[PDB]
Amino acid sequence: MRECISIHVGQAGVQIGNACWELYCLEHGIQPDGQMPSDKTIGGGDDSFNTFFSETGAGKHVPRAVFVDLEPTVIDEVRTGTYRQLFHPEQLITGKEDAANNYARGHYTIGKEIIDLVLDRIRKLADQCTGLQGFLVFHSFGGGTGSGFTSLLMERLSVDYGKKSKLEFSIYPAPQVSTAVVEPYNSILTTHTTLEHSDCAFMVDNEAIYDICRRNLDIERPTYTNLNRLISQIVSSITASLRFDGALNVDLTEFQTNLVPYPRIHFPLATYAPVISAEKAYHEQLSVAEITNACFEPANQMVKCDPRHGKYMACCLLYRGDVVPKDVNAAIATIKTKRSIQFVDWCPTGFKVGINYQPPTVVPGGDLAKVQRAVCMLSNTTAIAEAWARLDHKFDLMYAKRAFVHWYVGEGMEEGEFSEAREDMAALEKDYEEVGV
Amino acid sequence: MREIVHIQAGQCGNQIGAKFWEVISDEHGIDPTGSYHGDSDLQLERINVYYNEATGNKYVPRAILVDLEPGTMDSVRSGPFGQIFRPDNFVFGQSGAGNNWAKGHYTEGAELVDSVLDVVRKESESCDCLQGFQLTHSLGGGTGSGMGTLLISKIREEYPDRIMNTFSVMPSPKVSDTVVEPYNATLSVHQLVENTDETYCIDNEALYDICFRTLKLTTPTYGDLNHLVSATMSGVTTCLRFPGQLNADLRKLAVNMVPFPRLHFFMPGFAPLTSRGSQQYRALTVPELTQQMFDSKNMMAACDPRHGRYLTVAAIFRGRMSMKEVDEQMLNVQNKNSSYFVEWIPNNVKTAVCDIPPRGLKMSATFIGNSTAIQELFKRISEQFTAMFRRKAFLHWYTGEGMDEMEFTEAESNMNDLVSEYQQYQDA
Amino acid sequence: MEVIELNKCTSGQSFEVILKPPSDPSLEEIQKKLEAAEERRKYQEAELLKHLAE
Amino acid sequence: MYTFVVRDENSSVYAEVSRLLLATGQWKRLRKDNPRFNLMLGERNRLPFGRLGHEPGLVQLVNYYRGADKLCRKASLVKLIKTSPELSESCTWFPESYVIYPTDEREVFLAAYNRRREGREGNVWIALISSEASELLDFIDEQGQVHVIQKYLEKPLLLEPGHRKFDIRSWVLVDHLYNIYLYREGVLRTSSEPYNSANFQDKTCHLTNHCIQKNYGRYEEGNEMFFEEFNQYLMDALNTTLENSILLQIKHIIRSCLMCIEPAISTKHLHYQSFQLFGFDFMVDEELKVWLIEVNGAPACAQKLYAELCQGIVDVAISSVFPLATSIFIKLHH
């Protein structure tokens, strides 16, 4: 067993974190007070779930988690909510003033002042670990803290834990639920600074999740809560292999090996099915073939883009529920004859498959129906670069007039960092083009 | 950033200021004595922003009341909510400012300003995390205009990393006390351009026209003008005062609304437009709110929005309504009139909703626009300035207090620079 | 068509299916950039304060 | 008020289409770069498909299918026919073709060239037209571009009077639902020079397009015979109709090409929708067999037909998605 520390940065990182840990407790049968009746080794152990949970002598199971926000009100809700007893007060870190939607403020001004304290609290969790494998980092691209503080933190984690893997769950900005007009600036700034420091990053476009909630959950105006219960299902699918017995994606290193052959091109597309409303009176349960086929529809992806017009470098299918290899292979053979799936010349055309027999757990009274089988596909496709193209175009529109740049310069950032960040993105868009056409 | 310190200066400043406190006190269920008597918990959640817990479960809204005359402040003290203000926060001289910016800024005001800064400091020292300041004043008099902008400069010196927000009442010949208003206003604008982060341009021309043409008041008083101001003021501070999705503050308002530091003069708007006492019984449909809030006749600055382009817009909808319909209507305005929104700021229109309606309405909309059409306001003031200035008329009132002509020449050029800066982005 | 690396446990199974074959800055430099940015902020502030002094 | 943008300036079809859209008074044209459009009439190259269908409150539609270049480039068409099971090398209606680079199937090309040497049949190939392989392979390397060698059609149907060559242009519109609509009006692009079997030191006698002719204009206005006349001719000369002898084969080829790429390009479950107008170019041999020459992705029309075709584009591609306040197409059913 090798431990993983989760880091949740800013409002989005924190609230998604709440949702993920809520779900993890439900999956492993851990109660809000941290008791786990099924865990027969009281006070310690090296089961698969211990990757994410430490244990006290009293048998409290505590997340290997740090929550950080530059302002208190979001983490204050963790401090006083259903799961308040789960987390040690020292794991929940807040400043008094936020980054005001400004990367430069999150990274340079306010960040400089809280960084050592956060690293010290991270150090405290690391010291409790027999063999720390590394980090899962949750944040928005668009927030001042989520962008600014995260990129500084990432830089520092590379210095202090040079051998450790770092994975990201990243909320890409969507105008339907955006908070700031400068989110494109913050996204490009944070991506540039973080790129060398992250091994694998799972991007979730709030536009995709919003539309999935509208179309499949019949929610007219999805809230953050609706979005996050869905996101936490996808994260749980992704991390299940770290938390349960298995032979696929068992350590963080294996995520890079299996999904990322080119280190800069480290953004796998996640696709999830099925999403079914809990209020749907009559539902015909979907087969292995139907859910697997649904992994190739844009409407089910975490980022809206078109994989038919790019190439694949890798593909994992992660099933939960009543699924056996033979039905997977039969589904794959059919899908291959109907769909444009093209791999890059130097990679095998194939699928790594993982099955866990436990069907997905749903949050009681939540929006998602219980289903007999579900799948998360992780594909490293060049098509995801469509998202970088959209974001870069928005950046260029504002930056050609230097609209809002003064707010960043006023925090000590040089104007030059904007065009450096943007050049790196230009190079990234280029990399995807070379590999994919 | 949590606490805001509110300052009200001069006759206009204190009259709109008193009305603002009346209106928001009602919304937060606070009574003339400072005792809470409401039912909703949304009322108390962010009450710290303005109000401040005192002895025996009381609320003392961070407010400092400033004048060079005692008249209006005696009127505040005996007015409906007069008892609520902290007595030590009444800071007044005796001699007045005679509608003269030089008296407020250089002579009479200089004598009183340190006493105000002592009260400001005392209030700031109680703050966990002071966001900054909001000032209510007019630009056409002498105290709110001259002493108000002196205060701003001194507050910036002592708190250079805090936000400065004003509600600034612009003079109009249609509602005019003295011929020197354009002088006072031009001198003040020069200061506002340098030392505020955000300024709401409340145009007395527009308030008059709304009262006359729309509310059918044949003879608008200051009290009718102020009814519109306090409703707009309640509207624009909604997201600072009530918990929602946004958790807005003064800095985030500035970051998102102001692409270039000098272009920070906002055109506010309100719907539905209502008079005092007289109010209609049918609520508006969300399409009607949206149409009325964007209508030039609902704007509090006498500028034609079609004569320019919106750099940024913040829209607040208040009441119980379909958020889906709000989004659809807001998206519809942009998609239907896209040329009036600059294409080089993606998604430059942001909407927020609050369940709690203002008093006596089921549905309301408040509009905050950063439009390049605001240049019309400054051109108007500039034309009126030059008409007198070219003959140096009425200048002796100012040179008698030690000012030189050069200072008028500089303030005029800066305000003309501001105008051409708006023209730049209207075309580019 | 070919199915490799079949692993089975009580919790589930994993395998691979092949359809076709193929064919950092130091603590020092960080501190420098963060202190350089503070120095730009202090300077911009001192220039404001001198303007206010005038 | 629906909105649209125009990003191809050189397009006669879409100039006319926008002109018609404005004339309804229910369509506003916006600036080239305004994102807030219902309709994009896009640029011919590097069209940013990745930026479409991410605008809340706007159904978005574009006049190109992403991936349709696979059909509409000389080199990639041959590749598409050879490698797709739906079509195959066995394919009866596309000439024998080989892809050649100037730096590839050079060795496999001239192996079939010896079947034309040994059991000597017609051994004339188009690249520009030669009888000799070694003169073709020089011409490719000397110009430094990727191009295709194709079996040239040595026994074409020849119009009388004149002993003339011709090609058929068919206009096909594929809507957002992937309905395939063949415009009922085609055009023959004739040679005005008599055809010469023993001479390939030629130009105007052999190459049929409207430009490399401007004997011009002799038998019909600007080397353009329309369908009513060409049918009449086929009745008079050959005792058949255009429908039976040619159009059945044309409809077959069009449907086969477009059904083949449908899974790669369809916008059925996508966040934006596509339509596209294609120009299919056909050759007819002397035994009334149809051969596909090329597919054009950005075609111009013929002067007489602009009005009718562009109105059809509005009615079936545009108004179907965006309704305003007899049919000129044959629907190719599937």
Ligand SMILES: Nc1nc2c(ncn2[C@@H]2O[C@H](COP(=O)(O)OP(=O)(O)OP(=O)(O)O)[C@@H](O)[C@H]2O)c(=O)[nH]1
């Ligand atoms: N999916 C999801 N997105 C969120 C949530 N909260 C915020 N966001 C998104 O995150 C972006 C805004 O950043 P936040 O994370 O709120 O900001 P922050 O990191 O707290 O930074 P500041 O508040 O600016 O200091 C926007 O694109 C939001 O739509 C959430 O709970 N779920």
Ligand SMILES: Nc1nc2c(ncn2[C@@H]2O[C@H](COP(=O)(O)OP(=O)(O)O)[C@@H](O)[C@H]2O)c(=O)[nH]1
């Ligand atoms: N809207 C509004 N304008 C006012 C009010 N009182 C004065 N004014 C305007 O304010 C300007 C005069 O300034 P005033 O505040 O009386 O002078 P001060 O006491 O020296 O600041 C003129 O433009 C008046 O029209 C008021 O109560 N409401």
Ligand SMILES: COc1ccc(N(C)c2cc(=O)oc3ccccc23)cc1N
């Ligand atoms: C143009 O985009 C915006 C404009 C303003 C805001 N914020 C921060 C608001 C703050 C506020 O105090 O009031 C508001 C009322 C409505 C909508 C936004 C605000 C945010 C964005 N993105």
Ligand SMILES: [Ca+2]
């Ligand atoms: Ca144990």
Ligand SMILES: [Mg+2]
């Ligand atoms: Mg925050």
Ligand SMILES: [Mg+2]
């Ligand atoms: Mg007065």
